Design a protein around this ligand. Structure first.
Ligand SMILES: Nc1ncnc2c1ncn2[C@@H]1O[C@H](COP(=O)(O)OP(=O)(O)O)[C@@H](O)[C@H]1O
Ligand SMILES: [Mg+2]
Ligand SMILES: [Mg+2]
Length: 334
């Protein structure tokens, strides 16, 4: 079974009359034809006018632009895709309908306005001036000529675990967890519980509530970098795919490079090829990586809040240093 299959997705959306639903939403405008985003222009959704300012990313099938809602003055991202990405809108709508935690609402992208054409969609959401973890990590490294501080990465990992934990509680698999798809929305606070990250880009997410309970998947990514452990050993997967992605992000944050996994021969345990330095909190990181990468089956996922506890205990041992590191981090990014 392949949960990313384009015809499956069409079938799923039709089965729940998605089109009929979004036609009723006041922040969504259906139109015949959506123009290509272009710098220094204006865009309207109903009554609301937006400046379209500068390109952020641009591929053959879409782009992201920064712009501004003229009335409120708020900066926005404008995300355009061909063909129309209904599925991305569906996941975003479901996430915010299933949320009950006041704490977690800022940590998932919210589509404020949607312009939905026959050819193309444009989704508008809050713009982050700090950008993705990729941009933040590269900025910090270029200024310091060092890897991101170990304890700042603990603080960020604690946050990512919390966001993924609540997402999985809602029966959603993001399925594209990478540093590119976490935004830093605001500076870091000393309190590890304060969320400053936001998960974005639900383009290939999986909604488990659309499938029977006990449903699993066996589709295998082509690119080795993105194969989770189950995909490498001919086994079924569900939430494991996101947990694999979490490790890959932590790896990029800690080491400035992309994760390769290997069996730690002669055992069957999978771990990153990179060795955690002995003067890092090595036992802690190894526990975290091992627990997230090596999962018995789809019936029971590891306790993510236990991992957060391990990180908070390490952060608590050095509260003075941590406050200092976060301050330097925030100052770099001002
Ligand atoms: N709301 C936003 N604020 C700031 N930057 C953003 C925002 N949305 C997207 N970006 C930038 O654009 C990149 C691509 O956006 P994303 O929604 O992930 O598109 P794609 O589906 O093409 O990966 C992000 O990794 C980020 O660097
Ligand atoms: Mg993305
Ligand atoms: Mg995407």
């Amino acid at each position: 079974f392949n949960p990313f299959n384009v015809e499956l997705i069409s079938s799923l959306l039709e089965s729940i009359d998605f089109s009929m639903y979004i036609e009723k939403l006041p922040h969504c405008q259906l139109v015949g034809h959506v123009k290509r985003l272009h710098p220094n222009t204006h865009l309207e959704v109903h009554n609301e006018k937006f400046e379209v300012s500068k390109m952020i990313g641009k591929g053959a099938y879409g782009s992201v632009y920064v712009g501004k809602h003229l009335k409120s003055g708020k900066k926005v991202a404008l995300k355009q895709e061909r063909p129309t990405n209904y599925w991305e809108f569906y996941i975003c709508l479901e996430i915010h309908s299933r949320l009950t935690s006041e704490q977690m609402i800022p940590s998932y992208a919210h589509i404020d306005y949607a312009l939905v054409g026959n050819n193309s969609s444009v989704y508008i959401s809050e713009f982050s001036d700090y950008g993705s973890l990729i941009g933040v990590c590269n900025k910090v490294k270029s200024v310091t000529n060092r890897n991101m501080d170990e304890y700042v990465v603990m603080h960020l990992s604690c946050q990512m675990l919390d966001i993924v934990d609540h997402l999985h509680a809602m029966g959603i698999i993001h399925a594209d967890i990478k540093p590119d798809n976490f935004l830093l929305m605001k500076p870091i606070c000393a309190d590890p519980n304060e969320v400053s990250l936001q998960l974005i880009d639900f383009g290939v997410s999986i909604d488990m509530k659309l499938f029977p309970d006990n449903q699993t998947f066996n589709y295998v990514h082509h690119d080795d970098l993105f194969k989770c452990i189950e995909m490498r050993t001919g086994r079924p997967w569900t939430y494991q795919l996101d947990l694999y992605g979490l490790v890959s992000v932590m790896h990029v944050l800690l080491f400035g490079r992309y994760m390769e996994v290997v069996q730690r021969s002669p055992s069957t345990i999978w771990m990153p090829k990179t060795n955690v330095p002995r003067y890092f909190q090595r036992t802690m990181w190894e526990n975290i990586f091992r627990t997230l990468l090596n999962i018995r089956d789809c019936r029971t996922m590891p306790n993510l809040q236990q991992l957060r506890t391990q990180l908070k205990c390490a952060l608590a041992e050095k509260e003075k240093y941590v406050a200092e590191a976060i301050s330097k981090f925030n100052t770099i990014l001002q």
